[PDB]
Amino acid sequence: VVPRSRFLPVKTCSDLLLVKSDLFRLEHGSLKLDPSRFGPNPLIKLGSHFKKVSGFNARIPHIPKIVELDHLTITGNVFLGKDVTLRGTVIIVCSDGHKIDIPNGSILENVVVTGNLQILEH
Amino acid sequence: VVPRSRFLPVKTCSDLLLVKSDLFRLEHGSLKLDPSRFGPNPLIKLGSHFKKVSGFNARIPHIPKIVELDHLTITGNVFLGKDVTLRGTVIIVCSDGHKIDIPNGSILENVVVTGNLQILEH
Amino acid sequence: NSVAASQMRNALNKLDAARAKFENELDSFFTLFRRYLVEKSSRTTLEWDKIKSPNPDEVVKYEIISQQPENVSNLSKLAVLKLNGGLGTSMGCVGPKSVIEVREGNTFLDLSVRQIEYLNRQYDSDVPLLLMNSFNTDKDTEHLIKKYSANRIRIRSFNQSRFPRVYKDSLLPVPTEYDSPLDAWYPPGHGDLFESLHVSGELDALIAQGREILFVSNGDNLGATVDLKILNHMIETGAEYIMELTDKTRADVKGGTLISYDGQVRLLEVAQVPKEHIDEFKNIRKFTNFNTNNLWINLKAVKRLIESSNLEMEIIPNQKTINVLQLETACGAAIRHFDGAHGVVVPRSRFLPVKTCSDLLLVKSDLFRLEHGSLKLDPSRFGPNPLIKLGSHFKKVSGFNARIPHIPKIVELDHLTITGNVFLGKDVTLRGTVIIVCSDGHKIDIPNGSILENVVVTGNLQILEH
Amino acid sequence: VAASQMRNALNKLAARAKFENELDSFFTLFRRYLVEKSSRTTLEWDKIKSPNPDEVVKYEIISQQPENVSNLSKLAVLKLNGGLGTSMGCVGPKSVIEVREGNTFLDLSVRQIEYLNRQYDSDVPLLLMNSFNTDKDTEHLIKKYSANRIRIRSFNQSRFPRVYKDSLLPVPTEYDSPLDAWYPPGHGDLFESLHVSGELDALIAQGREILFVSNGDNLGATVDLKILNHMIETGAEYIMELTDKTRADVKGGTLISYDGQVRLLEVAQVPKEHIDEFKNIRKFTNFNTNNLWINLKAVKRLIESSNLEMEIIPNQKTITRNVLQLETACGAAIRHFDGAHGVVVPRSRFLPVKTCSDLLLVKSDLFRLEHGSLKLDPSRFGPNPLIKLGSHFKKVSGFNARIPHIPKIVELDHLTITGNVFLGKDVTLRGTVIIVCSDGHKIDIPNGSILENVVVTGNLQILEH
Structure with missing residues (x-):
């Protein structure tokens, strides 16, 4: 037996977000988990x-601060802004047809997010 | 001929957003306009x-930081989160029978936002 | 008196009632209100x-209590x-x-009886159920208690205090007469327990x-059975107050x-943590426990501290518009003012709260069996x-009920979250994570017998009797 | 080390005139880059005042100066x-x-100098400084302006190589190996190539005597005599037009x-600690409109002694086979010139056309056209x-799809149009108009509608019955 420390698989872009986040620091080719993170x-x-x-990348060009997040699940066509923070449980689900732009700097925590929302450069 | 300082009518909840914002510090019963505010x-x-x-009060229970705003226009049924920042030009227009929930700590700067976003306490 | 205090004692002068002078009520309110304003001066946090x-x-x-004693005689004292x-x-x-x-037709209160009925029978004892009511409930409870005529329990109900709500702006005692509008009073919290108990x-x-001891629990806690091993621990270590804590x-x-x-040892709530530090408090990794409001309180000690008026708890100034101000206290807070008073961890087994219909589904499911007024968790369920x-x-x-008339089989489910207008059919099974979210405007009928497992469900779907 | 790597790799050939005087002029910049690349470039x-x-x-000053006609003989x-x-x-x-009205940019300028000439009897020459991306298309194009009251001439500027950002080796190998591999090194190249x-x-x-340089896409850059005489009375060798x-x-x-x-400070020269001060338009009140009046003799002398040397602008860009384009700005050269200084003009002489928004503006009842110049409407107050x-x-x-009939807007303050919107014949836009049309919709604004101070949204189709 060995701890997950050494089972860090990237099967899926969902895995790509995890290892890209502030949840990890890169030292000597190794993803060392934050000291804060105790779960x-x-x-x-x-x-x-x-x-x-x-x-x-189209959709998450700026990796959100996910350090206090448990469960994130996003569905349909969603674009995350710069400097977004995810906390607790975040369920964003945009249904067929639509698309949701989550504003820059937005900070979501224990929340279900749904609908249309388009944000455009004035 | 005085500066506009000594004209600050409050006719409308728009005026109310203004005087209630980080644009003014209060001091001994007088709104002092923020020093940085150039013009x-x-x-x-x-x-x-x-x-x-x-x-x-329904929609803005948390006056957004607007010390760097030029133009804000908000049409339709729109709710504003805690710690929104509105820079430059913001145009939020929400169509008939829709609703839009601007998520906490979003930084809207120079944008047109439109759509139908519901944000629900999970 | 103070300037704003002599204005309120003037309302104590302001406040068809033969020898039923609610001065007792008014006075107790005065001490709180005056101090509320005194503490209004200083930081009250x-x-x-110095928090350790x-x-x-x-x-x-819990392990420490567990394998120790078992004493029936104890029930002679327990209330x-x-x-x-x-x-x-x-x-x-x-x-x-x-x-x-x-559950299965039983109210909370039914289950209270059933659980105690069975306590009395198992050891041929007579422990009484005590229902501390308030002016909003007292009327109904005395009627509702009448049903258990000829049961194996002596249900005895009593009212707590009536206190006058105030105005946020003018800060003056809102009503006028012994009863102007009912929606003008308020019960002073479950800290007001002690006064109106005596x-x-x-x-x-x-x-x-x-x-000699009350075992105090919430109305809506189904887990709070009588734990003998605790009644013993409390009686051997001769404690005057025991609070039950769960992870x-x-x-x-x-x-x-x-x-x-x-x-x-005292009870720290968020309101009494300074704003620079709240986040540290909320950190579960630094605060492994919390108060289940399952309290064992030495009755003798209550008399002592009441007659020597020392029982002094924090003021929760909850506000409601019917803006207005309600000054209330909590039973738990009094803990410091008791000799040998300490806390005891216990498993969630006995923290089973029903705050919310979401909680109602949990306790209605196959996840529980009902035995002797108690929701015993399935043997299968190991998490x-x-x-x-x-x-x-x-x-x-x-x-x-409109929506979940037939409780789904939820025995292998982790996380369910449903949103918007959704109707669940007969014999639905939920597994793993089920996120059903129907957006504004729409409505989703989940077909009978349907079985969802690790799935996000969304959209419109109407199902109609042909 | 990167020096001899550049000069050796740049020396490979694969022609009658040796284009080396540029590849070497490049090396002078490409090297300089390394030197500055290290230490302070701020x-x-x-020390700024x-x-x-x-x-x-x-302008209050210039405003009242002669408006001399006989010195156009000195103007190019x-x-x-x-x-x-x-x-x-x-x-x-x-x-x-x-x-405007079927007139390109070129057309408007020609119309203006032509007017200058005809009205004053003077043969002022027009000069189009091209690049490789424009030269040929401008050479054949200009030939349309035959038999005119205008002596038109063009020329090309330098064809500097792009550099590979990571390897720091030049992009091309041959004199033509992809047309992606060259880049024109900015309007600072003006002098060098004018030479x-x-x-x-x-x-x-x-x-x-004097060049009156302006951007291609500036429509307000007319010849101001009132300025010409100021420039000559002062004997200043370089004047930069600045506007609030x-x-x-x-x-x-x-x-x-x-x-x-006196020098031009751009944002790049400001310490990262200070831009929150640079942008306070209470403290820095003008900007370089890029209308530059320039003494040709002073240019000759300065070129000859290689005294002209502007600030390096790296401008990193990309193309598919990242890359670096060291370039420069004529405006910044002003320090090297003697007597040089600036003059505060009205925004009139700044009318850039960068965007079809600019295009709606200059095409509207805001301006009457006259002898190649947009005159702003007299009623328009501010x-x-x-x-x-x-x-x-x-x-x-x-x-052109959506605005084939420029709306009357002489009384507009703010117009914002988002989404897929079509505008009828004879629309009038007063004050503030906001038309925002959601994804997948369309909106047809009906002929002769007067929109004044409104937000319009929805999905209106208008169909020829």
Whole structure:
């Protein structure tokens, strides 16, 4: 037996977000977990507009501060802004047809988010 | 001929957002305009769900930081989170029968926002 | 008196009533209100520097109680009170929250009886159930208690205090007469327990009836059975107050805990943590426990501290518009003012609260069996219980039954969260994580027999009898 | 080490005139880069001062100067022309994009100098400084202006190589190996190339004393006589036209006195600690409108002694086979010139056309056209209306799609149009108009509608019955 310390798989862009976040520091080719972080890692379930890697960067070009997040699950067509913070449980689910722009700096915590929202450069 | 300083009518909950904001420090019963603020007040055209004071408080229970705003226009049924910052020009227009919930700590700067976003305490 | 205080004692001069002079009520209100304003001057928040974490003596783990004693004779003294001042409007109900059907037809109060009925029978004893009511509930409870005529329990109810609500702006005692509008009073919290417990004379009568300890629990806590091993621990270590604590889960933060402060154990709530430090408090990793409000309180000690008026608890100035101001206190806070008073951890087994219809689904499911008024968890179930977060079309109880008339098989479910207008069919099974979220405007009928497992469900779907 | 790597790799050839004098002129910059790349490339903040009436002249002064006609014999006019028209959908130079009443940029300038000439009897030469991305298309194009009251001439600037950002080796290998591998090194290249062409020799040779340089896409850059005489009375060798800065132009360049000389401070030269002060338009009130009056003789001498040397602008860019484009700005050269200083003009002489929004403005009843110049309407009391057209309006094609009939807007303050919106014949836009149309919708504003102070939203289709 060995601790998950050494089971850190990247199967899926959902895994790509985890290892890209502030939840890890990169030292000598190794992802060392934060001292703050005293649990299991958060359960990230990004839906499929996040499957391919071009899709994922399109949508998460600025990795959110996820250090106090348990369960994130995002569904449908969603674009996260710069400097977004996720906390507790965040369920964002944009239904077929629509698309949601989550504003820059927005900070979501224990919340279900749904609908249309388009944000455009004036 | 005085400076506009000695003209600060409060006719409308738009005026109310202004005088209630980080634009002014209060001191011995007088609104002192913030020193950094270089020139004319920002132009605030809140729409009609904002007319009565009841509605105003409904949607802005947390006056957004606006010390760097020029133009804000808000039309339709819109709710504003804790710690919003409005820089430059913000236009939030929400169509008939919709609703939009601006998420806590969002930094809206120079944008047009439109759509239908519900944010629900999970 | 003070300037604003002599204006309120002037209302004590301001306040068809033959020898029923509620001066007792008015006076107790005065002491609180005056001090409320006195504490209005200073920072009224414990110094963070001097808050220290409890040591094994002050907060005893469960294992330590567990394998120790078992003494029947003890029941001679034990009494059981159930806090009953709550209305059930937040669950969409006219009346005492505790008369809502919670499981298989049984109300909270039924289950209270059943559980105690069975305590009395198992050891041929006579322990009484005590229902502390309030002016909002007292009327209904005395009628509702009449049903158990010829049971194996002596249910005895009593009212707490009536206190006058105030105005946020003018800060003057809102009403005028012994009863102008009912929606003008308020019960002074469950800290007001002690005064009206002895003002009713249940303090005496219980001591006189030969009883020495109350086991106090909430109306809406189904887990709070009588733990003999505790009644013993409390009686051997001759403690005068025992608070039951359970491990704080990620969604328990806001709740208060016991600390060690100036060599006493006392109850720290968020309101009494300074704003620079609240986040540290809410940190579950630094505050492993919280108060379940399952309290064992030495009756003798209550008399002592009441007659030597020392029982002094923090003021919660809750505000409601019917803006207005309600000054109330909590039973738990008094803990410091008791000799040998300490805390005891206990498993969630006995923290089973029904705040919310989301909680109603949990306790209604196959996840529990009902034995002797007790919800015993399945043998299969070896974890934490599932996190159920039903959205608001589920807030009132008529709404919830409309929508979940047939409780789903939830035995292998972790996280369920449903949002918007959703109707669950007969024989639905939930597994793993189920996130059903129907957006504004729409409504989703989940077909009969449907079985959802690790799935996000969304959209419109209407199902109609052909 | 990066030096000899550049000079050796740059020396490979694979022609009658050796284009080396540029590849070497490059090496001078490309090297300099390394030197500065290391240490401080930020002027000491603590030494900057705000100019004397000496160093920035207000118009109040110039306003009353002669308006001399007989010195056009000293004037030669230049427009910068290395800019493409793609960011407006179009292709070819920017300068040939229809701007007003079928007139391109080029057309309007020609019309103006032609007018200058005819009205005054003077043969003022027009000069288009092209680039490789414009030269040929401008050479054939200009030939349309045959038999005119205008002596038009063009020329090309330098064809510097791009450099690979990571490897720091030059992009091309051959004299033509991809057309992606070259870049024109900015309007600071003006002099250097004005020299290599020989118009510099020709202008002096033919008695032209002063160049009046302006951007291609500036429509207000007319010849101001009132300024010409100021410039000659003072004998100053370089004059930079500056205009007040507003909310929308914080990060434009401005002019300052600094350790004895007047120079242009751009944002890059400011310590990262200080931009929260640089952008206070209470403290830095003008910007370089890029209308530059310039003494040709002074240019000759300065080139000959290699005294002209502007601030390095790296500008990192990308193309598919990241890369670096070291370039420079004529405006910044002002320090090296003697007597040099600035003059505060009205915004009139700043009318950039960067965007189809600008295009709506200059095409509207806001301006009457007269002999190649946009005259702003007399009634119009103060600042131009603020036009923020959205993205379906970016390309010129789309613009014409939706506004084939420029709306009357002489009384507009703010217009914002977002989404897919079509505008009828004879619309009038008063005050504030906000038309925002959601994703997947369309809105047809009906003929002769008067929108004044409104928010319009929805989904209206209007169909020829």
